[PDB]
Amino acid sequence: SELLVNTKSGKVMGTRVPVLSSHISAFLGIPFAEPPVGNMRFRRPEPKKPWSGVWNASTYPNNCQQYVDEQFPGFSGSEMWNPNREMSEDCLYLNIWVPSPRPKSTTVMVWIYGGGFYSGSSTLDVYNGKYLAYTEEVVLVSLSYRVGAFGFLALHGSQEAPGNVGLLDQRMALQWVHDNIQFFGGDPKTVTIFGESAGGASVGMHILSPGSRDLFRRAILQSGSPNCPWASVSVAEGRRRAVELGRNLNCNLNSDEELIHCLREKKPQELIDVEWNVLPFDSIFRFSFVPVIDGEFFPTSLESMLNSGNFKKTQILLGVNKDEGSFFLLYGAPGFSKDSESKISREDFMSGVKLSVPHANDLGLDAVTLQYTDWMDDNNGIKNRDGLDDIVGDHNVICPLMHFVNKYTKFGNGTYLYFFNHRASNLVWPEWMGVIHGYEIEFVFGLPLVKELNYTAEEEALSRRIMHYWATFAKTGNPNEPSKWPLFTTKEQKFIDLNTEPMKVHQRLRVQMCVFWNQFLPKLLNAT
Amino acid sequence: SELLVNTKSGKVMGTRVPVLSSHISAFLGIPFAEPPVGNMRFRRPEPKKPWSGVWNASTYPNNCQQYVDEQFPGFSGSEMWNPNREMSEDCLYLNIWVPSPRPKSTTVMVWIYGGGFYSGSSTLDVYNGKYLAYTEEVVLVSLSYRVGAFGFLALHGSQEAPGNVGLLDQRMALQWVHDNIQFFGGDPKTVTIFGESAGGASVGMHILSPGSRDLFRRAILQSGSPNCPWASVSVAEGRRRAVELGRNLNCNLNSDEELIHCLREKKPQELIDVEWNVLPFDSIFRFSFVPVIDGEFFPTSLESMLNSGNFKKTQILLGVNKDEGSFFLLYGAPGFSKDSESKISREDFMSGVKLSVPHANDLGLDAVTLQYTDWMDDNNGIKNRDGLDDIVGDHNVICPLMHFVNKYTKFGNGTYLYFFNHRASNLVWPEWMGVIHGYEIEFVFGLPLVKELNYTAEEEALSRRIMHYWATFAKTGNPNEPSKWPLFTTKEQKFIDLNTEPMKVHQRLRVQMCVFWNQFLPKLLNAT
Numbered sequence A, B: 001s002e003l004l005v006n007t008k009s010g011k012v013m014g015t016r017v018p019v020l021s022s023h024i025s026a027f028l029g030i031p032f033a034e035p036p037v038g039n040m041r042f043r044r045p046e047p048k049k050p051w052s053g054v055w056n057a058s059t060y061p062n063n064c065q066q067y068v069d070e071q072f073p074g075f076s077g078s079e080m081w082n083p084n085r086e087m088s089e090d091c092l093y094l095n096i097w098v099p100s101p102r103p104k105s106t107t108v109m110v111w112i113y114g115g116g117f118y119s120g121s122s123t124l125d126v127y128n129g130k131y132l133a134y135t136e137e138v139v140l141v142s143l144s145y146r147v148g149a150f151g152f153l154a155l156h157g158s159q160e161a162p163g164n165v166g167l168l169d170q171r172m173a174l175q176w177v178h179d180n181i182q183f184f185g186g187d188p189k190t191v192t193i194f195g196e197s198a199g200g201a202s203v204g205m206h207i208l209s210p211g212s213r214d215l216f217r218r219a220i221l222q223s224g225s226p227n228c229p230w231a232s233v234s235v236a237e238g239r240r241r242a243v244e245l246g247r248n249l250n251c252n253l254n255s256d257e258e259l260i261h262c263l264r265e266k267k268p269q270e271l272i273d274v275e276w277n278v279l280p281f282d283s284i285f286r287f288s289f290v291p292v293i294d295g296e297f298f299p300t301s302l303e304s305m306l307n308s309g310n311f312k313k314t315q316i317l318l319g320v321n322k323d324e325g326s327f328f329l330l331y332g333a334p335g336f337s338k339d340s341e342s343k344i345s346r347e348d349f350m351s352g353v354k355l356s357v358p359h360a361n362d363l364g365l366d367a368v369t370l371q372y373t374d375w376m377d378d379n380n381g382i383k384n385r386d387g388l389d390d391i392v393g394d395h396n397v398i399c400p401l402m403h404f405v406n407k408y409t410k411f412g413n414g415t416y417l418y419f420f421n422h423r424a425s426n427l428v429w430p431e432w433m434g435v436i437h438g439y440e441i442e443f444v445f446g447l448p449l450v451k452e453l454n455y456t457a458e459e460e461a462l463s464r465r466i467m468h469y470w471a472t473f474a475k476t477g478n479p480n481e482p483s484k485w486p487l488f489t490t491k492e493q494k495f496i497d498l499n500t501e502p503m504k505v506h507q508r509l510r511v512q513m514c515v516f517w518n519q520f521l522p523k524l525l526n527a528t
């Protein structure tokens, strides 16, 4: 019986699932860790105590306790990201989609969701691995990890809440795949981890962390890189924010043991309800609890590590989307709404730059302004809107990622870079949002292959090309089958376009703006 | 007899001159000042002692003692600028081209040559006023003024060499036109002063200097503005350079009386031979002896004057040329030669920016670099060449001029702006030099109207349009005859293109680059 598998942790019973007029196996809800509840909250995950009896792996598990977006109640565009299961602190589970007939030892892809480290579930319809598993004969895993305070509260020094535990959760799921994936027909020596948003940052962080390097083969990062401004904080700032969280909940701030015991008493929703209140006011596009450069998971600064070659050397495939900033502006910069064209005013354009760079003086702001202002027309609302869109994009995702790929390529064993700029025919978000942060995921997981979803036939083509590049890379370290996506080299910096037009290669992705963000601006803020 | 005129200073006898199959009058070599020789050198001009008898005004006068360019011996492209008369310190003369029959009271245009304040004559074939006088029924005057040390040696405090005397020379010629031009049929209440290079800077300086404002009606500035970096120095720096000049000639440096008496003993060629030796090494595109902000001719800083509206309020017509920087690069930045395409190397591109902005740190240089580098291609010699061309242009002529026209327009009574980008069919300089600093002059003085000069028939058209705009403006304050050149306003910043294609209006001339040079860079150098 395919639906029955015996793992090092216990027998597991999966279920048969329909897919594109066929069927495959799916082991949903397998536990890889001990519920991080009660006195466990904020602690490193503990591995799941093995079990006798068969484990029902027929249905999706709970989603982790997280912030739920209600900006647009009922709107599909935003509800597709919210948890679609019951939220609980007992949420450390992974899912497996195994081809049928079960393979003997095939390519494994492990998905790490994103959500800025404050949100995210592995059970979203956009993360249904059945299409990719089926269309590409790959074993697909999707893991889960604690988010928000629950997975990132950091009181450096304490062992009750050292921080980064959400990343350890991830690592535990990865350890589990290394130890049992063979029983489902996956080859542990060929697992590719891939993620988008905080998931891409997370993927990058296991490339850096020595303790994670040996649990996977290759990596794929989508619109996220470890060095992104929103992905990490110092132990100093983490502690600052952790204290501040107790201040919001009326906790004895005497000692860490005290702090933690109160925080541990509060009901989940209580920490969620005040958790955005610790975010300092000069961090409008970031979230409160994120990975900490703690000296253990991250031996030194990400920058020195990137600089010295201190990281796993393998092949990597990463990329970004056309309009990375629209999401951030929509949810965090006034003047941008879901239903207007959100045209911006010169006066207001500048409050957005001031808003997207508090760490800058009237000189650094001028510098950003001069760089994104169109001096002959400048009173144009659209251009101003789009200018802010690019600023927030370039600064928060694209340029950090380009800096990472430039550094990574120096020591790596093959880099592949993409620029996804297709606007789905059925997008429910407005025109001004463009190709949105999060929207290449649909195509990577092959939702276009299902007619009910109203995509164009060519979009079914794009998704199929992407799914095949993704899986072919996972299987070989090269997206191309033995019309070629060229390696990204330090010299020629080539990359491709992912869209419906026929593939075209380009060079030096947003170099101009990224040389500004990466090299110039820093030197200037420092030199002033 | 037309050729005889009686002025407040003496009778003067001119001569008949042929022009475009016709004839006109020309009074060449009329003295407006007492020879500034002997104990006079470095002193304010003295007005010419009147005379009895008729003055022979039949032939061009001597040219002032100046540096003679021999970079390209025999080459027409550069020899057309060299003095074509005998050089002498007795050179303060003006020329007059009067229509025939002599007018009763017509438009007067007074030409002030340029030459960076180190060179220039009023007798160059490009400055032959006969064509413009004839084609437009205007009385045309061309003056002369001492240049180099002779006209600009500044020892603030001394009365033997206070500085700015070359500008006073100019003013004396202007005073003379105000007092006698009626006798030649010119209307003193309608004189327009116009000049190019230091001549345009000079024109601007009489708009600023209270002592000059009443000697003319309107002004025209061509590729020069008073605030240009190469047009002025502090009394401090002027004195510094004056001492340094004595050090080069073995002069007692005890006191100003001493210094000046030795400098006054040296033969002209002796000061010319060592005069570029005082130029500080962080001033590669400037010249040694230039106007000084002395508190008298210039009451305060040009910037405050421009800022407070402290200047003659009238109509002005000014403009710049496409490739203002090529001349400066050719004569002062290695790697640019008259006979190669002068392609530049990335490594070398940066030595040119470092070369064109010593007053900047590794941050200000980076800033210039980021602004003129094409990040995707950048190893391209042409683009690098052209990048340096624009940097030196924008910084030395165009942006200072745009800053002047923006400030001037705020208080003025009508501003007209042009962008001359026509490359003469018969240009003898190389392709990479483009539309050269100095090369619109040919068209303003109507050399194209003469077939022998090998211009195209359409270039005869362009020259005629320009000559008519220039004279029509001089006559009315508006280049347009009662296809319109629009006023340049602080709001719409419109300007036209001067070339052979049919006229097209544009907006905000090189705003992007000039906001960098005018507002951004300064703030940055200061803030660091």
Ligand SMILES: c1ccc2c(NCCCCCNc3c4c(nc5ccccc35)CCCC4)c3c(nc2c1)CCCC3
Pocket: A069, A077, A078, A081, A082, A114, A115, A116, A119, A196, A197, A276, A284, A285, A286, A327, A328, A329, A331, A332, A436, A437, A438, A439
């Ligand atoms: C107070 C309360 C909520 C806030 C907030 N919303 C957070 C809720 C939005 C998450 C929905 N989930 C989403 C995800 C992706 N793309 C989306 C694209 C459009 C809309 C929602 C998206 C990519 C993968 C990760 C999840 C955000 C901000 N500040 C807040 C301040 C700053 C900009 C980022 C979002």
Ligand SMILES: c1ccc2c(NCCCCCNc3c4c(nc5ccccc35)CCCC4)c3c(nc2c1)CCCC3
Pocket: B069, B077, B078, B081, B082, B114, B115, B116, B119, B196, B197, B276, B284, B285, B286, B327, B328, B329, B331, B332, B436, B437, B438, B439
């Ligand atoms: C040592 C010795 C001479 C130097 C020099 N030559 C000065 C001689 C060139 C003047 C010829 N006279 C010229 C004029 C115009 N355009 C030209 C355009 C092309 C060639 C010569 C030109 C516009 C009106 C003013 C006169 C120059 C420089 N440094 C020198 C360092 C720095 C760049 C400016 C010229």
Ligand SMILES: *[C@@H]1O[C@H](CO)[C@@H](O)[C@H](O)[C@H]1NC(C)=O
Pocket: A056, A058, A059
């Ligand atoms: C597995 O759990 C689900 C949860 O509702 C249940 O409906 C299903 O029947 C279970 N399967 C078995 C055979 O235990």
Ligand SMILES: *[C@@H]1O[C@H](CO)[C@@H](O)[C@H](O)[C@H]1NC(C)=O
Pocket: A412, A413, A414
């Ligand atoms: C990857 O590494 C292997 C040996 O370790 C080498 O043969 C191969 O060419 C490398 N490829 C790249 C792009 O570095």
Ligand SMILES: *[C@@H]1O[C@H](CO)[C@@H](O)[C@H](O)[C@H]1NC(C)=O
Pocket: B056, B058, B059
């Ligand atoms: C005017 O001076 C020139 C100088 O050579 C001379 O040739 C000419 O004959 C003179 N004219 C008269 C009538 O004095």
Ligand SMILES: *[C@@H]1O[C@H](CO)[C@@H](O)[C@H](O)[C@H]1NC(C)=O
Pocket: B412, B413, B414
């Ligand atoms: C120039 O000034 C006069 C009055 O001094 C005024 O009527 C005219 O409109 C002004 N033009 C401009 C452009 O300022």
